[PDB]
Amino acid sequence: PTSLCCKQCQETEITTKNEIFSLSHETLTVYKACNLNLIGRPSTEHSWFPGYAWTVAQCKICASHIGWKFTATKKDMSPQKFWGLTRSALLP
Amino acid sequence: SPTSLCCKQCQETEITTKNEIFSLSHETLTVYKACNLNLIGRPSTEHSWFPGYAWTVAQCKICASHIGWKFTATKKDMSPQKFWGLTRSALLPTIP
Amino acid sequence: SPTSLCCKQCQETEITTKNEIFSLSVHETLTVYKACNLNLIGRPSTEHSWFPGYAWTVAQCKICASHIGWKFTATKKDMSPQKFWGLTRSALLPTI
Numbered sequence: 499p500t501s502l503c504c505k506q507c508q509e510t511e512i513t514t515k516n517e518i519f520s521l522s523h524e525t526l527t528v529y530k531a532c533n534l535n536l537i538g539r540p541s542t543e544h545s546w547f548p549g550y551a552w553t554v555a556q557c558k559i560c561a562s563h564i565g566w567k568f569t570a571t572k573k574d575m576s577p578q579k580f581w582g583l584t585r586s587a588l589l590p
Numbered sequence: 591s592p593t594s595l596c597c598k599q600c601q602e603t604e605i606t607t608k609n610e611i612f613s614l615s616h617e618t619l620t621v622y623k624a625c626n627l628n629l630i631g632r633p634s635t636e637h638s639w640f641p642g643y644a645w646t647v648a649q650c651k652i653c654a655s656h657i658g659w660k661f662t663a664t665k666k667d668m669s670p671q672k673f674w675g676l677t678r679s680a681l682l683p684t685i686p
Numbered sequence: 687s688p689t690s691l692c693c694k695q696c697q698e699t700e701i702t703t704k705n706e707i708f709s710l711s712v713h714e715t716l717t718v719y720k721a722c723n724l725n726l727i728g729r730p731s732t733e734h735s736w737f738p739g740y741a742w743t744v745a746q747c748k749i750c751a752s753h754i755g756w757k758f759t760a761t762k763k764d765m766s767p768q769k770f771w772g773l774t775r776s777a778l779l780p781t782i
């Protein structure tokens with residue numbers, strides 16, 4: 499079970515286990531994701547990953563809030579972006 | 591394990607790996623990342639299979655075989671902003 | 687399975703995973719599409735680039751400043767990938 503799908507609509511892939519990495523466990527961090535819509539503008543308010551801003555990411559099919567796009571605030575950081583996804587919002 | 595997906599024509603050139611496959615919501619494999627491809631021309635939305643993306647022809651850098659297309663998002667709110675759609679028959683699963 | 691590739695010096699800091707490895711064309715340098723926990727030092731240079739058409743930028747562990755390798759950035763838009771990491775294999779430790 500490599501595919502990680504939206505738990506709400508069940509059929510929509512958001513990421514795969516192949517994309518998981520460890521920046522430092524409610525929040526999965528992946529390099530890549532799909533089938534997400536970004537809501538609003540980035541914010542640093544209470545960012546869990548200092549030096550990154552977050553943007554709400556919802557399932558493009560059912561609007562379930564799956565997590566956030568994290569965007570680097572400085573060009574010297576790696577990666578420049580990633581996804582922090584709520585593990586309970588994904589199947590498996 | 592045949593993890594490496596190589597250009598079937600020149601055989602030696604890796605284009606992607608099974609690690610990069612994803613499922614966008616089928617003759618065409620979609621991967622987040624690929625290598626050893628040259629882009630031909632400028633992006634086009636004409637008859638795009640993935641609405642909201644433009645396509646650019648992608649050929650093997652070694653033998654110029656047409657492997658597939660780079661897909662590039664037309665809007666900032668889409669994820670991913672880019673991916674590759676590769677013709678499955680243009681690739682050889684290689685254990686290396 | 688040791689999927690995680692960590693900085694050998696500070697041991698606990700993940701830099702990449704085996705999932706991100708690809709083959710551009712050697713023994714010494716691992717090429718991966720994605721990495722984390724690296725700081726870029728200075729500006730890109732093509733001087734003695736091992737990967738013709740790419741510039742290199744020194745990449746050091748953000749925790750202990752160990753020189754792990756380089757960010758490679760494409761000098762032409764038609765190349766794929768547009769960036770990757772070339773990491774000295776001996777600077778990394780396979781971990782969980």
Ligand SMILES: Cn1c(=O)n([C@H]2CCC(=O)NC2=O)c2ccccc21
Pocket residue numbers: 543544545546547552566
């Ligand atoms: C409800 N809620 C939430 O889940 N966050 C996440 C957003 C992502 C992150 O990095 N850190 C947070 O605390 C909020 C941040 C500010 C205000 C309200 C917030």
Ligand SMILES: Cn1c(=O)n([C@H]2CCC(=O)NC2=O)c2ccccc21
Pocket residue numbers: 636637638639640645659
């Ligand atoms: C020969 N040919 C082709 O293969 N396509 C692909 C390009 C990729 C895609 O998304 N959709 C297509 O129909 C064409 C699109 C327009 C005109 C001619 C085309």
Ligand SMILES: Cn1c(=O)n([C@H]2CCC(=O)NC2=O)c2ccccc21
Pocket residue numbers: 733734735736737742756
């Ligand atoms: C000490 N040193 C080094 O390791 N390199 C690498 C940088 C990465 C690459 O592609 N090629 C190299 O020769 C140098 C390149 C120029 C001058 C001094 C260099």
Ligand SMILES: [Zn+2]
Pocket residue numbers: 504505506507508510557558559560561562
């Ligand atoms: Zn959904």
Ligand SMILES: [Zn+2]
Pocket residue numbers: 597598599600601603650651652653654655
């Ligand atoms: Zn070829």
Ligand SMILES: [Zn+2]
Pocket residue numbers: 693694695696697699747748749750751752
């Ligand atoms: Zn370190």
